[model samples]
Target: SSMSYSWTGALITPCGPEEEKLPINPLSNSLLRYHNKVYCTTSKSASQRAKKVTFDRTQVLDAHYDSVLKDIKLAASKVSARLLTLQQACQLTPPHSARSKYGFGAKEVRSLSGRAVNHIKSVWKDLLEDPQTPIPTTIMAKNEVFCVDPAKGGKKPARLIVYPDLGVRVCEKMALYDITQKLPQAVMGASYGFQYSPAQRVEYLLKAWAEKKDPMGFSYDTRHFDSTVTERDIRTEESIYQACSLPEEARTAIHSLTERLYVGGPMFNSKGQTCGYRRCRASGVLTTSMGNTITCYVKALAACKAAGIVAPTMLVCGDDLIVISESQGTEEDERNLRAFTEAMTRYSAPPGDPPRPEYDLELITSCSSNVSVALGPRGRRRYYLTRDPTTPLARAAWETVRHSPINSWLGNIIQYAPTIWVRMVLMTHFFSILMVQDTLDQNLNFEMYGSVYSVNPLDLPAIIERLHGLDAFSMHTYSHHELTRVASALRKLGAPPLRVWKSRARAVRASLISRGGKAAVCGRYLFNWAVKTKLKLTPLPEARLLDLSSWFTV
Candidate 1:
């Protein structure tokens, strides 16, 4: 028997003062009538998450896995990682970062306070000196918000997020941020999934799928993916990091950091109780995303080779993976998939649902999204990426009342700009809300990646066009699956159906048109679908310098 974590008898505690939010919110109700319960995972679910995360991952990785890891390390060796100037890493600290146990936080670090800088110097010194002591980490429940399911009677528990003190986090950025930015992309190359936007991802998948003479595709999600990563995987990741040609000091620091923090550490709850010893991946480490991405890719590539999945093109993002390969034949393809799953299981990367061959591209989902085609300009078919809107709609409602740091509605509106639901229901409802409040000109703040930006609500037309392209405005004739999902989501939320949203948009469009200028721009661009007679539109002046290339670097 083996385990990713060994827990003591302490409960996971909240780090900050906790409050209970009302299940029913008027601001949410204003968007939709009779809104039903949307569940938020809490500490009550901590034990459940812990129980789920506790599992045996002891297995001998196949020779193919070792062979692939050699390539990864070879590629990694080409990378030359360097230490950053302390000032530079401090500047990268986010404003909302948590405080260190030493009573300092982002504010102190950002300002380059003497106390903070001095403390960080000592922390770095310890990294140079100590190699075996486990760095302390704080464990908290992840706030995963979801819709209540009818059949699953009990509430889902919160996910455990293990992170270190603020000082160590800044130190992490100092040491490995550059490695994270460069390493994953270099090692994984085309197989790396995070580089693709939803649109580009759709295009890439279709093109890859079409090129195959007889393609068979299937998608899978690792069950508790981070936990599935074994001690060997972590050491293997460290080796990959070490393979990077580096200065002597950089090399020593990386090795020390790996031995001290990257591989395993002590976990404490907010109550200061020793909650557990985590031998698996820490959810809050600077390397979590990069580590997860590469580990999954390695496991995937190894499985493909072991199973003899010919010409397999894998799209891997964290736990989500899709393998589209040239099929040998029906029975052979099925048998190959069985072998693939078996290989993956042996490597300790088992799927939540057993992988099965899928004929339709639309049914194979990755990153909780799938591609669907819609009618575009000149009656041409255009494909777009989308997923169930229930979570987005629920979060939007939550935002209205709780006033979360980032506007969930704005994020959905931007990300799902081409989708029927965003173009129809969400924009119509929110625009009406803003209209009644007389705040269309008021700059609203939203988050993308980890960075935040403020833009006028009216500027969304320009933002939408710039990010999603002009086709976002013209997309229509959505598939029944998309339509049915939206309809069902609306019903579950007690929101007005698509017809009512169209009716409401007519009013909003008329109002915006009467106002003219930027208001008219939104009308002509965003709600062109609502009008009987459409207007000829040109690109907006504001869209020129709206590049967001730097937003997702982290």
Candidate 2:
């Protein structure tokens, strides 16, 4: 019962030849030491990850848990969801998604070719016809780049990613996409974290902290959150879906999908051998995000009640959570949090690190990010979201060497526009790349939160104004922890320090100002902090004309 994956002799295989992602150049290697450290997970590591994630779970049900479950079901019942049209589901599939067992890829699926449509229809029909037939999913080692930790031994194997064929992926969208979109918000209300932008997240955290009379905050991350999700937990998730008012077909499809696809599946490898079997949550499905968010929220809410933590404001993003609540006293607050962690463990959602009470809000990290303050216009303090920037910096270096369609630097620039790191380092880093390459006229895609945006490098000034606001240009004072983290990360990576970046930025902005029309906009707005003189910033006309709606096709 504790076994998550029942395995055979077959190994999880990669589809193509894999190469080291980052190479040694003073330009790229200074950003990250990825030469030997960036290793793809292997079959042995697959076995290792399977061992780590595989476990038995225990759920402690109590009066508080029951009441919350009832409330959640009631909230779900208020939302009416319907199955998506087959064509619509097909369109939602990412263009480069895995090839199906029958040979057609995402391109054929999206274009609604006769072969793809016929096969998908057959798959959906099979779901309704056979209620308890288990689906076969491929278990592959996740291709992820990680830093080597000698303490854990060099190069941890990649995590296991279990996924069904491409046809089933489209079918998953047909069955659960509607419910995924609507249910979390209905049940969790303000606590649903996927709905918030980076700026909005910071604002909500600060506001929630201010409202708490004697607030103490803490973050909770469940260890192997997907693995800990038992069969019973998935049944509970299914019940929440069934609680929603739905068409007869939709209801039957949901029930069949729960028994057939969601609860458990057989795992196959690339070599057509039976690899293993999965009995816990599958990470590749459309509902993984929503499933984890709803289940984690329920467990944390029940735990808060059991521990008697008063006036709690919960922010949940998948497995990452933040709880800000009124404190009884310093000693009691600490004691109550211990009880909360204990209760969470009893419910099978144990913390990766034991939760501790925090008096200052900035100390809490949730969703791999934290709230940090900076000075805006006229030195007024403003809060913004930021992380350590290790991954982003590492990725930016990789992107710089290989010109991929999606630019991480620009994506970070837009999302964390107001943060000092983005304003100084990322902006400085990317513009120099563009200026050197003379790709300012060429459009690059900046994909964020499932949306694709086509951005001409020179359009950044207006883009920032429209999304992050004009105050982004004048931000100066940064919080101590934020500055310290960036500087150390820079030093740790052997990248040139911030002062040298400022020197580079000053040189770039001057040439940028003289070149062209919006070049001056980028120079003035982006480099306002690096320069002595500041422009009296006004809302430009293009800011109003800019249409970001193309990115929000959802």
Candidate 3:
């Protein structure tokens, strides 16, 4: 009854690997294999039968299965040996028996207390089925199921056996300690029969340490839940996160931050309402800096760091959390927000801290300054690190660049212009979004208003190329931070059905595809625009400008 069981819910429309059928099992379908891997039989009714699906793998588990039966026999022998030791120890101390009045033979007392042991043996015998039939081996560690001969009479049926002797023995005096302390003893002695082993105990200890440490590391590795997970499966999950198809830098930032524990006040919105948080499937973190996030983060990070402790997590709430809110009104609120920002920035580590560019106001200011001097006034307006990058410093860097020479950074910079801009421009461009309930309404609104306020394609591309080339700085570009939101929003709002929606998506994709055409235009722009801006005091011939464009090709 206390055994753990595994199950899957309804198939996610876009499931993994076999992007064909969802994983949710359908009724009346026997399991089948394709390419030597297991898959539930396909069914038209699969989408509807979310009822239940379960498989017991007790037998196929290494010790409980073929090729490892020797180990199982060894473990079983060890169990018997340990029991003998326990009996001897108990006999040496007669006072241990509560029922001294009913003095009995040692074997009788041992037999009576050994009832649970017999039960374990019987259960394991049923669960670890006769090994005569081949238990299929799995190639994909994650997908592989531990299975044994399913047919009867082929081998002894296996039942999972476990015992209390496997649990650690503790002195009654020590047991007086808090239940939390007693937990280890109880767990160490407790054993699942087929699973009983010294290695298992060591594993339990390591895990117990990881879980029961002062501050719990409760974070889950969505891919590697336990020993059953294969290294390949882990690699696959990692690859997904690292794939060039996604924004690696932002994802990397998000992923790294999530691995650590975060302690901060829950993020609240403009009205001080909590921004209910969730783990980002893309980055695998729960983060936000909505209302008091920045301040709370500052306090937590500073306290943690100062105490020589690295809280291995990021406490965040809203993906849209920003340093400045256009919707915010009072100067008082602004000042308070600034205070929180200052603290968070001061305490938090740089996005790549302990490395170059220790993220800080100084570094962001430095980066912004470098970018500004490299790109000039026009360049300064494009930086948007002031708003977002999943880190205090990244956001600061954006702010410094965007608000370069100005106190406030712009939101919806693209709402005013093109995607390509100074870093600030791109930041604002990427971050600015409207939650349109109707795709048609949004598309029409965008089409009607798109060109009028649209980023001058020529201007944005030219700006991005020139700034990137002019400044020797690397940029994060767009990431899942932006993509997940876009993809999710589009799907949620049913954007696919609308022609204009697709068009808009493609149009946006096009701009990004060609760097908004900046690369191609770089040669001409550098000659026509960039060369002229730098040499404000002098006007050079157009022909000469074209000659210098050769090296501008990225």
Please report the candidate that would top TM-score against the real structure. Answer: 1
Q: What is the lDDT, from 0 to 100, of the residue 267 in candidate 2?
A: 85
Each candidate's lDDT (Cα)? 0.82, 0.81, 0.24
- How do the predictions measure up, each by TM-score? 0.96, 0.94, 0.19
Which regions of candidate 3 fall more than 4 Å away from where they truly are?
1-10, 15-299, 302-554
How big is the positional error of residue 359 in model 2, measured in Å on the Cα after superposition?
A: 1.3
lDDT of 1 by residue, 1-554 (tens): 35789899899987665445566675466566644466667777798899989877776787999999998899898887788878888888999788888979899999999999999999988887887788999999987677777666646678889998998888887888889888987887777788876677888899889989988899978889888888778888888888887777667777777777777888999899999988889999888888888888888889999988999888888778988999888898889889988988999888888888887887888889998889965788888889999788777766423355226777788778899999898888767777777878888766766778787888999888777778889886889899999999999888888888889899999998888988878877999988777666677777877985544344
Q: Where in model 1 is the C-alpha error above 4 Å? A: 399-402
Quote the positional error of residue 453 for candidate 2 in Å. Answer: 2.3
Q: Between which residue pairs do clashes occur in model 2?
A: 41-158
- Count the clashes in each prediction: 1, 1, 44
Report the poorest 10 consecutive residues by lDDT, candidate 3. 134-143
